């Protein structure tokens, strides 16, 4: 079903429904996708209060959530239209990123800089909304979880913490968020393996032209990318076609490791920078 009428089922206030009346167009995930749901399921908060509570399990959980769009908030009825794939929908901003018109948005679990009251902790239950980040902050915040999990492989016990604090203040567009004190969990570990395997095969497929390209370029050119990367023949092109292509199988996969689901693609952004017409679930 598409239209999802929602039971509140808790004891809400006038100050509650006034907030959602201005929030019409927000992103609420639902797990069950009925026409009639209750607010125990409606909302994302009911799983971010788990006891383990790391980014490794919250990110892999909510890709089984189904996103909805807030509509018709009067009193106790919440109309949540399930969006269809490829219609234009507007979205009110839930997290302070300006979304920079023309790009792909994603779903970020929770701010996790503390535990934000998403609406109001009503009867010790708030309704917390996902962050919808423009896929650059999504990939980067998922990169650093594996950056600092590869780090903890070959560090003893302190140069993790001296280098995570180097890398956890993610200064993005309008936001300086925090990596959630990176917990080594096995969903990272099963996929940190395949990343390390994907790094291995690119070394195999690097057929001494793709290898030496920077190291031949530094002799001729003086570029900003070329100088920062200093510190950091054969007549077989048809075989180089297949090796580069098999290399492209890996990098479209190892990016897909740390990238997220493509989601709401920006049609237009208001000059208020709050409501954003977006297509493509």
């Amino acid at each position: 079903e598409t239209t999802v009428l929602v039971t509140f089922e808790q004891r809400l206030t006038t100050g509650d429904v006034g907030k959602l009346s201005r929030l019409i167009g927000a992103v609420i995930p639902i797990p069950y996708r009925h026409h009639l749901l209750g607010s125990s399921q409606v909302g994302l908060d009911a799983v971010v209060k788990d006891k383990t509570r790391d980014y490794s399990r919250m990110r892999a959980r909510m890709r089984e959530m189904t996103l909805t769009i807030m509509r018709r908030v009067e009193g106790n009825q919440m109309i949540l239209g399930v969006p269809t794939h490829g219609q234009c929908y507007t979205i009110r901003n839930t997290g302070p990123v300006s979304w920079e018109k023309g790009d792909v948005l994603t779903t970020l679990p929770p701010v996790f800089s503390g535990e934000v009251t998403g609406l109001v902790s009503v009867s010790d239950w708030d309704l917390v909304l996902p962050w919808i980040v423009p896929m650059a902050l999504a990939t980067e915040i998922n990169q650093r979880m594996m950056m600092l999990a590869l780090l903890s492989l070959d560090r003893s016990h302190e140069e993790v913490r001296a280098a995570t604090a180097q890398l956890r203040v993610v200064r993005y567009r309008d936001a300086t968020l925090t990596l959630p004190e990176i917990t080594i969990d096995d969903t990272v570990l099963i996929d940190m393996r395949n990343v390390c395997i994907s790094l291995s095969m690119i070394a195999n497929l690097s057929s001494e032209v793709t290898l030496a390209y920077v190291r031949k370029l530094a002799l001729e050119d003086s570029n900003m990318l070329l100088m920062k990367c200093q510190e950091i023949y054969n007549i077989t092109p048809t075989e180089e076609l297949n090796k580069l292509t098999a290399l492209f199988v890996m990098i479209r996969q190892i990016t897909d490791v740390i990238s997220e689901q493509p989601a709401f693609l920006v049609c237009d952004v208001s000059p208020d920078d709050k409501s954003a017409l977006c297509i493509y679930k």
Partner: protein, 48 residues
């Protein structure tokens, strides 16, 4: 079918319509009975 359907996420059902079509079972009864050949010929031939 009727459907008591309600509830905040209570799993509701759709109008499950059911038809059946009952066959008959046969069990024929048969009794024999005899009539004597003498019992026919004293009906039929009718002597003096």
């Amino acid at each position: 079918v009727p459907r008591v359907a309600t509830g905040a996420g209570i799993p509701t059902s759709r109008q499950t319509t059911v038809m059946v079509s009952k066959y008959s079972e046969k069990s024929p009864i048969t009794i024999p009975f005899e009539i004597s050949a003498a019992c026919l010929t004293h009906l039929k031939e009718t002597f003096e």
